Amino acid sequence: QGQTDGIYAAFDTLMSTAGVDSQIAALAASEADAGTLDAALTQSLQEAQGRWGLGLHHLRHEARLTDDGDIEILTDGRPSARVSEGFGALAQAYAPMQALDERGLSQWAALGEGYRAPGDLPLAQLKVLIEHARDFETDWSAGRGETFQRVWRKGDTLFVEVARPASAEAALSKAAWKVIASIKDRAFQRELMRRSEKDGMLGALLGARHAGAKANLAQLPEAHFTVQAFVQTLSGAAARNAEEYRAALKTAAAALEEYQGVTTRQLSEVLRHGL
Amino acid sequence: RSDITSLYKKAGLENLYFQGQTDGIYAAFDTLMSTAGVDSQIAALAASEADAGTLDAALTQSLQEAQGRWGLGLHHLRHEARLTDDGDIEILTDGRPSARVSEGFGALAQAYAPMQALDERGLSQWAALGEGYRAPGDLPLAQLKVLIEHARDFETDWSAGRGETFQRVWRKGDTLFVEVARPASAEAALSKAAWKVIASIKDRAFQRELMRRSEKDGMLGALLGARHAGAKANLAQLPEAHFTVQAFVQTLSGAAARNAEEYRAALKTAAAALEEYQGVTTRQLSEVLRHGLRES
Amino acid sequence: GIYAAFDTLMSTAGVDSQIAALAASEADAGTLDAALTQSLQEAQGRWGLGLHHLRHEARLTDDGDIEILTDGRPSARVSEGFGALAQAYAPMQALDERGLSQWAALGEGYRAPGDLPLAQLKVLIEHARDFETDWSAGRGETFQRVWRKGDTLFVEVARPASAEAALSKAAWKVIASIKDRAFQRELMRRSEKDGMLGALLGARHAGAKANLAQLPEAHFTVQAFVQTLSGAAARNAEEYRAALKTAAAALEEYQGVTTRQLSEVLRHGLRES
Amino acid sequence: DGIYAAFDTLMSTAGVDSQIAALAASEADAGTLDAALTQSLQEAQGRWGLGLHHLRHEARLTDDGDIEILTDGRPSARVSEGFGALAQAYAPMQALDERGLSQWAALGEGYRAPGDLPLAQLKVLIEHARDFETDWSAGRGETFQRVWRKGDTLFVEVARPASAEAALSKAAWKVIASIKDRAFQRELMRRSEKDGMLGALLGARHAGAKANLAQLPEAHFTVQAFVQTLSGAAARNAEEYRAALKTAAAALEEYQGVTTRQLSEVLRH
C-alpha cells in the first residue's frame, strides 16, 4: 500500500521550526521528477540542520522520497526516520548522535577528528588563521548577549556559527511567557497567567478547543525542534578576510535573535486571532 | 685510439668504485642511495636471504628518505621501488613506473626532470601539499607561531635562512616538516669534493702541482689528470655525477609539532645536518678521487 | 673619479678604453663621447648580454657623470653603480638555459638552423642577402652563430660564464699562489663559510659582503667574441670558417687575460691591506 | 567618352579581365575605382614583361575623366593620350638585354644571385634565406625564369620574350596557315619574304600600313611573362616553389596562346 501527501505539509511544518521555508507541498504539486524533490528535500534539510543546533555538521544529511510516497531522512546514507513516523521519532533518532557539554553545545568537530583551536583565541591570532591557514576549526567561546560562537573553514568556505542552546519544550514555553508578559491590559494579562496554572502557559493562549489544544500541545514539532544556532558562510576571497569574518559574526548573531523570536511572534498572532 | 684508452680508464675507475660493494642491481641501488646520505644496505638484506616483500619495503623506505635529500622538489608525489622478475628494480611515482635502475642513473635523472619545477635559485616551485594556499615565507615569527600551534595542514613559501640556506615548513596530519635547502648541482658537488682533496694534501710540492693544474682544467680534472669534461665523462656512469645532497627535512610530531620553539630548534638541526652532508662525499667516490695520487 | 669607473667597467670586457688618460689630455667633449661609445660597443660585443639589436652609446654630462644609452634613450648613469647598469640591462635580455641570448641580431624575421649542413650554409654566405643562423655548438665546448648585415658578416663565438664564477676563479688563483702555508690554509678554511672571494677579502660580515657585490666584475665578464668580415670576405665560406677559428682563439685569449688581470688586482689589494 | 573601355582594352593585352567599365557604370566611387585601376595595372605589369618590378605602379583618375598612369608617384602617361604614348613613357625606364630580358633587379640595389644556380643551392635560399633574388636562367621550352623574395612573399617569374611586332607576325602566321587555298597561302607565304607576315595580310604596303594603323594597344603590348606568388609557410617550401614554377610556365603558355587566338580573330575579321 502507498501512503498520502500530508507527508509534504508535515515536512514543511518541520522545516518551519528551523526557520526554513521549503515549500515542499507546493513543489509536490508541480509534479517534478523525484530527483527535483529529493534535491529540494535535501537542500532544505541541510539548512534546517544548520539552525537546529544538534551539532551534526560532520554527518552527511539527505532526504528522499520512498516507494510508498513517504519521506525518508538519512544521515551518512543510513536511514534515521520517516516523516510519517512523527516528529518525536526524528528528534529521538537524532539524539543518540549528539555529544553535548553541560551548556548544551556540541562537542563534535565540524571538520571531524583532528586539532581544534581554543575558543578564547585572541582576534590577533584568529586573524592569522583566517588569512594564512588552510582548513582550521575553533572550539566554542563565549559571545555577546549570552551567546556562544565558533568558526571553522573547509576548502573554499568559511563557516561562522553562533548558538544559544535551549530545549524545544523550554523555548516553546518561554515564547508563551513572552506573549503573556507583553500585554498592556493588566486584567487580561492576570487572567491568562491564572489560567496557565491548570492549562499551561501555551494552552492558556487558547489555540482552539480542549482536545484541539492537546492536538496543539504534545505532537507539535515546536515541542521537539527549535532554533538554537545560525551558521553564516563566506566564500572565495571573502573567506580569508578578517573584516569580512567580523561582519559575518555580527550578521549571524543578529539572524540568531531574529529566528529565535519566531515562536513568540507566532503565538502572539494566535492570541490576537483568539480574541 | 682515444676511445679505447678512454674505455680502459672508465672501466678501471668503475672497478675501483664497486670494489667491496656486494650484489649487482642491489649494489647499484645502494650507491644511488649513498649519494643522498642514506645507508640502505639492500645488498645485505638480499644476502641474508630476506624475502622479496621485505626488500620492496626497504627499497621504498630508502627511496623516500633519499627524496628528502636530493632536492628535486617531488614531495607531492608518492615514491616507490620494487623488484622485478628479470632482476631489475623498478622506480614508480604516484604508482606509475618512471624508471628502471638497470637503465643507469642519468636515465633516472632524466625520468625525474619532466616532473620538476625549479626556480632561478634551484628551489622547487611545487607546494609539498599540492594545490592550495601557501603563506608568505617571511612571516613574523609571532604569526608563524599561530599557524604552528593552531592550524591544520598549512604550508609556507621558501625564504632565506641563516647561513646561506633557504627554508620552508609545512604540516601534513600529525607531522610538521621543516625543510632546509642549499641547492648545488652534482657537478659543483664533485668540484667541492675534489677541492677538499686538493686542500688536504700535505706534500706542498704535489699540492701546488695539483692547484696549478686546477687553474686550466678543473678541480676534478686536476685530480684525474684530465681536462675538464673529460674528467666528467670518466665519472658519468657513477651516481655522484647525477645526484647529491641539496636539502634536509627534519620532522616533528606529536606535541613537539605544535611547539614554535621546537620548530626553531628543528631549523638549526636541519641546517647543521645539511652542512654536514654537503661537506662530505660518498666513501666510494672518495676512494676513487684519492687513488691516482702520487704523494700524500 | 667617474672616468676610472668607466675604464674599470671596460676592463671587464678586455677593452682598454683609456678614458682617464684621454680626459687628462684635455680632449674635447666630442672626442671623449666618441671614445666612450666606441669602447662601450666593443664591450657589448664581448659581455655576451645579447643586445646586438640595440644601439649602444655613452656620453659625458655636465655634472661629471657618464650616461649610457640604448636606442638613444637613457638606460643608466655610471654614478648609480654597476649593479644599476646590470639591472637596467636585465629587462632587455632573453637568455636561454645555456646562458645564450634568444634575441636575433637582425630583429624580427626568419632564422636558419644552427646545425645546418656546411655545404648549405655556404650557399647562404655566398648568395643570400641579410641572413641569420640560430645558436649551435662549436669547437672546444663553445657555441657559435653567424649573421649578415649589408656588407658585413658577423661571426659570434660564445662560452657563457657567470660573472660571480669568474670572480671566484680569480680569487682562487690568488689563494693558490700564496707562499705562506699557514696563511694559505687559513684562507682555504675560511673559504668554506665565506666564499672564495669573501675569504680573500676578509669579508666576514654584512656590508663587506654587500660591497663585494658592487664590483663590476660581479656583474659583467667576457662571455663571447664577435669577428667581422666585410667586402669579398663576407661572401667567402672558407673565410667564414677561418673566422670561427680566429673568434674562438680571441675569446679564449680575452677570458684568460681578464681573469689574470683580475687576479693581479685582487693580489695587489691583499698585499696593500 | 570610352576611357574606361580603353583601359579595359589595354588590360586585355596582359590577359587581365579588369572589368573597369563595369564598375564606372555601377557608380563605384573614386577610391575603389583607383584601387581597381591600380590593382589591374599591377597585375598587368606582371605579365607584360616590361621589367619595372622595382617601381611602384599607380593608376589614378582626373577631372576630365581619364586614367592617369604614374610610376613612383611621378606621372608617366594618360590613357586619353593613346597607348603608344604609354609605351614611349615606359621605354626610357627599361633596361632590356639582347634576349629581351630586363637587367633590373626586382629588389633594387643589393646583391643578386647568378642565374644558373643548381636547384640544390636555390633550395637553400628558398628554405632558409630572408630576402634574396636570382638573375635570369633558362627554363624548359625556350622559356626563361627567375625568383626573388621580398618580406613574406616569394615571386616566381617565367618569361618568353617577344616584341609586339613578333606577336603580330605570329598571329598573322597562324591566320595564314588557316587558309584552305594552298595557292593563296603559297602566294602570301612567299609575299612575306619581302613584306613580312603582317604585310602579307595588310595587302597594300607593309612598311606604311603597319605604322599608319597602330591604333590598338596590341601593337604596343603583349604577354611575355607570368609571375606567381607564394606567401607564409608556402613561401619557404621548396616543393611549393617547384609547383609554382611549373604553374607559372603553364599559365604563360595559356595566356600567350589565348592572346594569339584573339589576334587571329581580330586579323580575320
Short mmCIF file of N, CA and C in Angstrom, two decimals, chain B residues 55-173:
data_model
loop_
_atom_site.label_atom_id
_atom_site.label_comp_id
_atom_site.label_asym_id
_atom_site.label_seq_id
_atom_site.Cartn_x
_atom_site.Cartn_y
_atom_site.Cartn_z
N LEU B 55 62.36 -6.75 0.96
CA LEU B 55 63.25 -5.96 0.11
C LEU B 55 62.51 -4.83 -0.57
N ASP B 56 61.29 -5.08 -1.04
CA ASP B 56 60.50 -4.00 -1.61
C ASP B 56 60.27 -2.90 -0.59
N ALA B 57 59.91 -3.27 0.64
CA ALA B 57 59.70 -2.25 1.67
C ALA B 57 60.98 -1.47 1.93
N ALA B 58 62.11 -2.16 1.99
CA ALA B 58 63.39 -1.49 2.23
C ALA B 58 63.72 -0.53 1.09
N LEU B 59 63.57 -1.00 -0.16
CA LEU B 59 63.80 -0.14 -1.31
C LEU B 59 62.94 1.11 -1.24
N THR B 60 61.66 0.95 -0.91
CA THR B 60 60.77 2.10 -0.91
C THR B 60 61.13 3.08 0.21
N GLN B 61 61.34 2.57 1.42
CA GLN B 61 61.67 3.46 2.53
C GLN B 61 62.96 4.23 2.24
N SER B 62 63.97 3.54 1.71
CA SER B 62 65.22 4.22 1.39
C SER B 62 65.01 5.26 0.29
N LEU B 63 64.25 4.91 -0.75
CA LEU B 63 63.99 5.87 -1.82
C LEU B 63 63.30 7.12 -1.29
N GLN B 64 62.33 6.95 -0.39
CA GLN B 64 61.62 8.11 0.16
C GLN B 64 62.57 8.98 0.97
N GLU B 65 63.36 8.36 1.86
CA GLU B 65 64.33 9.14 2.62
C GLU B 65 65.27 9.90 1.69
N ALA B 66 65.74 9.24 0.63
CA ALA B 66 66.65 9.88 -0.33
C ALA B 66 65.98 11.04 -1.05
N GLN B 67 64.69 10.91 -1.37
CA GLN B 67 63.98 12.01 -2.00
C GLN B 67 63.96 13.21 -1.07
N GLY B 68 64.00 12.98 0.24
CA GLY B 68 64.09 14.11 1.15
C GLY B 68 65.43 14.84 1.14
N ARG B 69 66.45 14.30 0.47
CA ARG B 69 67.80 14.86 0.45
C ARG B 69 68.20 15.41 -0.90
N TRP B 70 67.83 14.72 -1.98
CA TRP B 70 68.28 15.11 -3.31
C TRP B 70 67.84 16.51 -3.72
N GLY B 71 66.77 17.05 -3.15
CA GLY B 71 66.35 18.39 -3.51
C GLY B 71 65.64 18.52 -4.84
N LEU B 72 64.95 17.47 -5.28
CA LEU B 72 64.24 17.53 -6.55
C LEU B 72 62.90 18.24 -6.45
N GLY B 73 62.32 18.32 -5.26
CA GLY B 73 61.06 19.03 -5.10
C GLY B 73 59.85 18.21 -5.50
N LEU B 74 59.87 16.91 -5.23
CA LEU B 74 58.79 15.99 -5.57
C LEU B 74 58.13 15.46 -4.30
N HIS B 75 58.00 16.34 -3.30
CA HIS B 75 57.33 15.98 -2.06
C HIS B 75 55.86 15.64 -2.29
N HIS B 76 55.26 16.17 -3.35
CA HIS B 76 53.84 15.95 -3.60
C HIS B 76 53.55 14.61 -4.25
N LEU B 77 54.57 13.86 -4.65
CA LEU B 77 54.41 12.57 -5.31
C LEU B 77 54.74 11.43 -4.35
N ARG B 78 54.10 10.28 -4.58
CA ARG B 78 54.42 9.06 -3.86
C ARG B 78 55.53 8.32 -4.59
N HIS B 79 56.56 7.92 -3.86
CA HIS B 79 57.74 7.29 -4.44
C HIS B 79 57.81 5.85 -3.98
N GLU B 80 57.93 4.93 -4.94
CA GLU B 80 58.07 3.53 -4.62
C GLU B 80 59.17 2.91 -5.46
N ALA B 81 59.67 1.78 -4.97
CA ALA B 81 60.65 0.97 -5.67
C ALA B 81 60.30 -0.48 -5.42
N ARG B 82 60.49 -1.32 -6.44
CA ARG B 82 60.10 -2.72 -6.31
C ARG B 82 60.96 -3.59 -7.21
N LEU B 83 61.22 -4.81 -6.75
CA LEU B 83 61.96 -5.79 -7.52
C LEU B 83 61.09 -6.33 -8.64
N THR B 84 61.71 -6.61 -9.78
CA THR B 84 61.04 -7.24 -10.91
C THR B 84 61.65 -8.61 -11.16
N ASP B 85 60.91 -9.44 -11.90
CA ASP B 85 61.32 -10.83 -12.09
C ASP B 85 62.61 -10.93 -12.88
N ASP B 86 62.88 -9.97 -13.76
CA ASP B 86 64.05 -10.02 -14.60
C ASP B 86 65.28 -9.40 -13.94
N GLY B 87 65.30 -9.33 -12.61
CA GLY B 87 66.47 -8.90 -11.88
C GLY B 87 66.64 -7.40 -11.76
N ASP B 88 65.63 -6.62 -12.13
CA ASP B 88 65.71 -5.17 -12.11
C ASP B 88 65.04 -4.62 -10.86
N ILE B 89 65.19 -3.31 -10.68
CA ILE B 89 64.48 -2.54 -9.67
C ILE B 89 63.73 -1.45 -10.40
N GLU B 90 62.41 -1.44 -10.25
CA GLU B 90 61.53 -0.50 -10.93
C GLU B 90 61.15 0.60 -9.96
N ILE B 91 61.32 1.84 -10.39
CA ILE B 91 61.03 3.03 -9.59
C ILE B 91 59.78 3.68 -10.15
N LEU B 92 58.81 3.93 -9.25
CA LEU B 92 57.48 4.42 -9.58
C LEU B 92 57.21 5.73 -8.85
N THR B 93 56.43 6.59 -9.51
CA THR B 93 55.95 7.85 -8.95
C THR B 93 54.44 7.89 -9.11
N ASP B 94 53.73 8.07 -8.00
CA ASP B 94 52.27 8.01 -8.00
C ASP B 94 51.77 6.71 -8.62
N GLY B 95 52.50 5.62 -8.35
CA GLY B 95 52.10 4.30 -8.78
C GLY B 95 52.42 3.98 -10.22
N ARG B 96 52.90 4.93 -10.99
CA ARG B 96 53.23 4.66 -12.37
C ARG B 96 54.73 4.42 -12.52
N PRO B 97 55.16 3.40 -13.25
CA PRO B 97 56.60 3.25 -13.49
C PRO B 97 57.17 4.49 -14.14
N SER B 98 58.33 4.90 -13.65
CA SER B 98 59.08 6.01 -14.20
C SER B 98 60.46 5.62 -14.66
N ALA B 99 61.11 4.68 -13.99
CA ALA B 99 62.44 4.31 -14.45
C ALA B 99 62.78 2.92 -13.94
N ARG B 100 63.85 2.36 -14.51
CA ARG B 100 64.43 1.11 -14.04
C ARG B 100 65.90 1.36 -13.76
N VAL B 101 66.39 0.84 -12.63
CA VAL B 101 67.76 1.15 -12.23
C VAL B 101 68.76 0.61 -13.25
N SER B 102 68.44 -0.50 -13.91
CA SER B 102 69.37 -1.05 -14.88
C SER B 102 69.66 -0.08 -16.01
N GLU B 103 68.77 0.88 -16.26
CA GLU B 103 68.95 1.83 -17.35
C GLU B 103 69.95 2.93 -17.02
N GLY B 104 70.50 2.96 -15.81
CA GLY B 104 71.52 3.92 -15.44
C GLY B 104 70.94 5.11 -14.68
N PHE B 105 71.85 5.84 -14.03
CA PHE B 105 71.43 6.91 -13.13
C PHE B 105 71.11 8.20 -13.87
N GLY B 106 71.85 8.50 -14.94
CA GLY B 106 71.47 9.62 -15.79
C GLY B 106 70.06 9.46 -16.33
N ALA B 107 69.68 8.22 -16.66
CA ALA B 107 68.32 7.95 -17.10
C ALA B 107 67.32 8.27 -15.99
N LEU B 108 67.65 7.94 -14.74
CA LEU B 108 66.75 8.27 -13.64
C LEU B 108 66.59 9.78 -13.50
N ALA B 109 67.71 10.52 -13.57
CA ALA B 109 67.62 11.98 -13.52
C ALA B 109 66.74 12.51 -14.65
N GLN B 110 66.92 11.96 -15.85
CA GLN B 110 66.09 12.38 -16.98
C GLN B 110 64.63 12.03 -16.76
N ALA B 111 64.36 10.88 -16.13
CA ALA B 111 62.98 10.50 -15.84
C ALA B 111 62.33 11.49 -14.88
N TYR B 112 63.10 11.99 -13.92
CA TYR B 112 62.52 12.93 -12.96
C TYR B 112 62.38 14.34 -13.51
N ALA B 113 63.26 14.75 -14.43
CA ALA B 113 63.27 16.15 -14.87
C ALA B 113 61.91 16.67 -15.33
N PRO B 114 61.14 15.95 -16.15
CA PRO B 114 59.84 16.49 -16.60
C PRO B 114 58.89 16.82 -15.47
N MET B 115 59.11 16.28 -14.28
CA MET B 115 58.24 16.49 -13.13
C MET B 115 58.69 17.65 -12.25
N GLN B 116 59.90 18.16 -12.46
CA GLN B 116 60.45 19.19 -11.59
C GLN B 116 60.00 20.57 -12.06
N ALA B 117 60.07 21.53 -11.13
CA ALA B 117 59.72 22.91 -11.45
C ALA B 117 60.61 23.81 -10.59
N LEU B 118 61.89 23.90 -10.97
CA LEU B 118 62.86 24.65 -10.19
C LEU B 118 62.91 26.11 -10.64
N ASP B 119 63.02 27.01 -9.67
CA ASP B 119 63.16 28.43 -9.95
C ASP B 119 64.62 28.75 -10.22
N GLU B 120 64.91 30.05 -10.37
CA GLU B 120 66.26 30.50 -10.69
C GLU B 120 67.25 30.26 -9.56
N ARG B 121 66.78 29.99 -8.35
CA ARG B 121 67.65 29.67 -7.23
C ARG B 121 67.94 28.18 -7.10
N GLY B 122 67.31 27.33 -7.89
CA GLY B 122 67.43 25.90 -7.72
C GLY B 122 66.45 25.32 -6.72
N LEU B 123 65.50 26.11 -6.25
CA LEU B 123 64.49 25.68 -5.29
C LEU B 123 63.22 25.28 -6.02
N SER B 124 62.55 24.27 -5.49
CA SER B 124 61.34 23.78 -6.13
C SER B 124 60.24 24.82 -6.00
N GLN B 125 59.43 24.94 -7.05
CA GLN B 125 58.27 25.81 -7.05
C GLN B 125 57.00 25.07 -6.69
N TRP B 126 57.05 23.75 -6.57
CA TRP B 126 55.88 22.97 -6.20
C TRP B 126 55.63 23.09 -4.70
N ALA B 127 54.36 23.10 -4.33
CA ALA B 127 53.97 23.00 -2.94
C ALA B 127 54.06 21.55 -2.49
N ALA B 128 54.59 21.34 -1.28
CA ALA B 128 54.63 20.00 -0.72
C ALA B 128 53.23 19.42 -0.54
N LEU B 129 52.26 20.26 -0.23
CA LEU B 129 50.88 19.83 -0.02
C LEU B 129 50.02 19.94 -1.27
N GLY B 130 50.58 20.32 -2.41
CA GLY B 130 49.80 20.41 -3.61
C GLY B 130 48.98 21.68 -3.69
N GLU B 131 48.06 21.68 -4.65
CA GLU B 131 47.26 22.86 -4.94
C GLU B 131 46.62 23.39 -3.67
N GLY B 132 46.80 24.68 -3.43
CA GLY B 132 46.24 25.31 -2.26
C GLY B 132 47.04 26.53 -1.86
N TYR B 133 46.51 27.22 -0.86
CA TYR B 133 47.15 28.44 -0.38
C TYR B 133 48.46 28.11 0.32
N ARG B 134 49.44 28.99 0.14
CA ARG B 134 50.70 28.94 0.85
C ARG B 134 50.95 30.30 1.50
N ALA B 135 51.41 30.28 2.74
CA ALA B 135 51.66 31.50 3.47
C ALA B 135 53.00 32.10 3.05
N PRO B 136 53.18 33.40 3.26
CA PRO B 136 54.48 34.00 2.99
C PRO B 136 55.57 33.28 3.75
N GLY B 137 56.75 33.24 3.15
CA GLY B 137 57.90 32.63 3.78
C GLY B 137 58.64 33.53 4.72
N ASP B 138 58.24 34.80 4.81
CA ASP B 138 58.90 35.78 5.66
C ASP B 138 57.94 36.33 6.71
N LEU B 139 56.98 35.51 7.14
CA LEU B 139 56.05 35.93 8.17
C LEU B 139 56.79 36.30 9.45
N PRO B 140 56.26 37.25 10.22
CA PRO B 140 56.78 37.44 11.58
C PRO B 140 56.64 36.13 12.35
N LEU B 141 57.64 35.83 13.19
CA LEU B 141 57.57 34.59 13.95
C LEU B 141 56.34 34.56 14.85
N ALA B 142 55.87 35.72 15.32
CA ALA B 142 54.69 35.74 16.16
C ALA B 142 53.45 35.22 15.43
N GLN B 143 53.40 35.37 14.10
CA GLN B 143 52.27 34.86 13.32
C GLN B 143 52.49 33.41 12.87
N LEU B 144 53.72 33.08 12.46
CA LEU B 144 54.03 31.69 12.16
C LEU B 144 53.78 30.82 13.38
N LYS B 145 54.00 31.36 14.57
CA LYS B 145 53.68 30.65 15.80
C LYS B 145 52.22 30.24 15.83
N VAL B 146 51.33 31.13 15.40
CA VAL B 146 49.91 30.80 15.40
C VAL B 146 49.66 29.65 14.44
N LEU B 147 50.22 29.74 13.24
CA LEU B 147 50.00 28.63 12.31
C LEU B 147 50.49 27.31 12.89
N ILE B 148 51.70 27.31 13.47
CA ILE B 148 52.27 26.07 14.00
C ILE B 148 51.43 25.54 15.16
N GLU B 149 50.91 26.42 16.01
CA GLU B 149 50.21 25.95 17.20
C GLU B 149 48.78 25.50 16.91
N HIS B 150 48.08 26.18 16.00
CA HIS B 150 46.63 26.02 15.92
C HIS B 150 46.08 25.63 14.56
N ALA B 151 46.87 25.69 13.49
CA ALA B 151 46.35 25.36 12.17
C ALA B 151 46.26 23.85 11.99
N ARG B 152 45.69 23.44 10.86
CA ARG B 152 45.82 22.09 10.37
C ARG B 152 46.83 22.12 9.25
N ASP B 153 46.69 21.32 8.20
CA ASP B 153 47.67 21.33 7.14
C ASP B 153 47.84 22.75 6.62
N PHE B 154 49.07 23.23 6.66
CA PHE B 154 49.44 24.55 6.20
C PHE B 154 50.82 24.43 5.56
N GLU B 155 51.21 25.45 4.80
CA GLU B 155 52.49 25.44 4.12
C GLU B 155 52.92 26.87 3.87
N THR B 156 54.24 27.10 3.92
CA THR B 156 54.81 28.41 3.63
C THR B 156 55.68 28.34 2.38
N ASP B 157 55.98 29.51 1.83
CA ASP B 157 56.90 29.62 0.72
C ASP B 157 58.34 29.55 1.24
N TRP B 158 59.26 29.30 0.31
CA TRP B 158 60.68 29.43 0.63
C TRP B 158 61.00 30.84 1.08
N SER B 159 62.00 30.94 1.95
CA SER B 159 62.63 32.20 2.26
C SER B 159 64.07 31.91 2.62
N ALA B 160 64.88 32.95 2.67
CA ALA B 160 66.26 32.77 3.09
C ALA B 160 66.30 32.34 4.55
N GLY B 161 67.33 31.58 4.89
CA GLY B 161 67.57 31.17 6.26
C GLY B 161 68.95 31.62 6.70
N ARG B 162 69.37 31.21 7.90
CA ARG B 162 70.68 31.61 8.38
C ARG B 162 71.76 30.74 7.75
N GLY B 163 72.84 31.39 7.32
CA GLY B 163 73.97 30.67 6.77
C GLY B 163 73.85 30.29 5.31
N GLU B 164 73.32 31.18 4.47
CA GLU B 164 73.21 30.95 3.03
C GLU B 164 72.28 29.79 2.69
N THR B 165 71.36 29.44 3.58
CA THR B 165 70.37 28.41 3.29
C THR B 165 69.05 29.06 2.89
N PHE B 166 68.12 28.20 2.49
CA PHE B 166 66.73 28.53 2.27
C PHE B 166 65.90 27.56 3.09
N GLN B 167 64.69 27.97 3.48
CA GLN B 167 63.91 27.16 4.39
C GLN B 167 62.42 27.29 4.11
N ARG B 168 61.69 26.23 4.44
CA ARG B 168 60.24 26.30 4.49
C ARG B 168 59.73 25.24 5.46
N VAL B 169 58.43 25.29 5.74
CA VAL B 169 57.81 24.37 6.69
C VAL B 169 56.38 24.09 6.25
N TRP B 170 55.93 22.86 6.47
CA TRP B 170 54.53 22.51 6.25
C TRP B 170 54.09 21.46 7.25
N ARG B 171 52.77 21.31 7.42
CA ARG B 171 52.22 20.27 8.27
C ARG B 171 51.30 19.38 7.44
N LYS B 172 51.47 18.07 7.58
CA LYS B 172 50.57 17.10 6.99
C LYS B 172 50.13 16.19 8.13
N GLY B 173 48.85 16.25 8.46
CA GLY B 173 48.32 15.45 9.54
C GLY B 173 49.02 15.76 10.85
#
